[PDB]
Every structure is written in C-alpha cells, then in structure tokens.
Design a binder for this molecule. Structure first.
Ligand SMILES: Cc1cc2nc3c(=O)[nH]c(=O)nc-3n(C[C@H](O)[C@H](O)[C@H](O)COP(=O)(O)O)c2cc1C
Length: 137
C-alpha cells in the first residue's frame, strides 16, 4: 500500500514575492528532494496559479505534498486527483517546470489552469508528456 506508484495533481494560487527568485529556489530544492524520494513530475506556472503533478511511491507523494502544502509561496491548494498508476508519465523529470510561454505553445486553451474542464488534467498530461518523449532515445 505504501509503495504502490501514485500520481497526485493539485492546483494552487501563486504567492510569489519575486517569481524568478522564488521559482529558482523551488526548482533547486525539488530537484534534490524529488530525486531522493523517487518523485518525478511537472510544475505548470502561468503567473497566477501552479498546477503540479508528482508521481512516485504513495508514501513519498503523501510526504511531499505535506511539505509543499506547508509552503507560503502558494495558497488555496486543492488536489485535483490522486491516482494509482502502472507507470510514470514523466519518468525522466524530477520536476520539470513548464512556464507561461511554453504552456501557451503546448496547450493554448489550458493556459489559464482553471481546471474547470473535466479533461483538463488528462489533456495537460497528454500534450506535455508528448512534447517530451519526441525528444527521447
Ligand atoms: C508550487 C510549489 C511547488 C513545489 N514543489 C516541490 C517539489 O516538487 N519538490 C520539493 O522538494 N519541493 C517543492 N516545493 C518547495 C518545497 O515546498 C520545499 O520548501 C523544498 O523542498 C525545501 O526547500 P529547502 O530545502 O531550502 O527547505 C514546492 C513549492 C511550491 C510553492
């Protein structure tokens, strides 16, 4: 139970004193932590909301989400879903940040990250995974 692979995706409101400096520290932090924990995933940032997907052992996602929810640089955190999974969707990335510009190019209709559509996360996952992947092997 504690080991099974899961994917969690949550949406939060950005609460950044300085976006570049704040996001650099988040990526720096996460690249080392996720690697150790066995987490992989993607962070979408559009200037207003973050949408984060992390995937790994159920117990490591629980732990991480706990820490991330204690982070003052975002608010109104609410999980979209938590799903057992067969295989990682973003195995190659400890945390890949996907910022405003690239989300515009990859998923023009989802740039708002409202997640009001019932297939917005699946769509984000599909188009982002696919963009990566193309560069693989
Ligand atoms: C929206 C957002 C996403 C974050 N994602 C991660 C993450 O995926 N992995 C991680 O280790 N920390 C993440 N963090 C930062 C953590 O909250 C935590 O502060 C960090 O791991 C520890 O920084 P420190 O090692 O300097 O204390 C995120 C923070 C925010 C605001």
């Amino acid at each position: 139970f504690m080991d099974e692979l899961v994917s969690l995706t949550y949406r939060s409101r950005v609460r950044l004193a300085d976006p570049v400096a704040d996001i650099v520290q988040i990526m720096r932090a996460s690249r080392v932590r996720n690697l150790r924990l066995g987490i992989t995933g993607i962070l979408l940032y559009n200037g207003v909301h973050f949408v984060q997907t992390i995937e790994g052992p159920r117990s490591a996602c629980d732990e991480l989400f706990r820490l991330i929810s204690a982070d003052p640089r975002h608010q109104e955190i609410l999980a979209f879903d938590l799903e057992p999974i067969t295989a990682r969707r973003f195995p190659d990335w400890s945390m890949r940040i996907v910022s405003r510009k690239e989300l515009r190019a990859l998923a023009p209709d989802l740039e708002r990250l409202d997640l009001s559509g019932p297939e917005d996360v699946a769509e984000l996952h599909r188009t982002i995974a696919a963009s990566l992947s193309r560069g693989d092997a």
